[PDB]
Amino acid sequence: GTSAENLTAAESRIRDTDMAAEMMAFTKNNILTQAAQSMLAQANQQPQGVLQLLQ
Amino acid sequence: GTSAENLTAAESRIRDTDMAAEMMAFTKNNILTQAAQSMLAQANQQPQGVLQLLQ
């Protein structure tokens, strides 16, 4: 029983994930995704030099 | 992806044209065309010495 509990703890620490750290990373990546979305929406509007030609 | 973006930038700078410079050149050439048109209209009228002969 003692050995099984100790090895279970070891295997948990090796393979299982901490919820808090992954939550942090996921929120960070979502915020970065939104930022890149807005930046791309701006960059698509940036090349508008049609007022050179017409008037 | 990085290499493709860099080579795309290079190819764009080589082959694609800047709209502003060509707009400048086109406006310049149109103005010169109009000037030459007026000059030719004048030069065609310049040789009128018929008042030597008749009266």
Answer yes or no: are the C-beta atoms of B23 and A52 closer than 8 Å: yes
Give residue A52's region: left, alpha or beta (phi > 0; psi -120 to 50). alpha
Q: CB contacts < 8 Å between A and B, how many?
A: 7
Output the CA–CA distances (angstroms, integers) from residue B32 to B15, B25, B36, B44, in the order listed: 27, 10, 6, 18
Identity (one letter) of the amino acid at B54?
A: L
Mutate to test the interface with A, among B18, B19, B26 (most CBs of A within 10 A): B19
CB contact under 8 A, B20 and A53: no
User: Which residues from A are below 8 Å from B19, CB to CB?
Assistant: 49, 52-53
Exp. method: cryo-EM
Residue A53: CB partners within 8 Å, gap ≥ 6?
Answer: B19, B23
Write the DSSP symbol of residue A53.
Answer: T
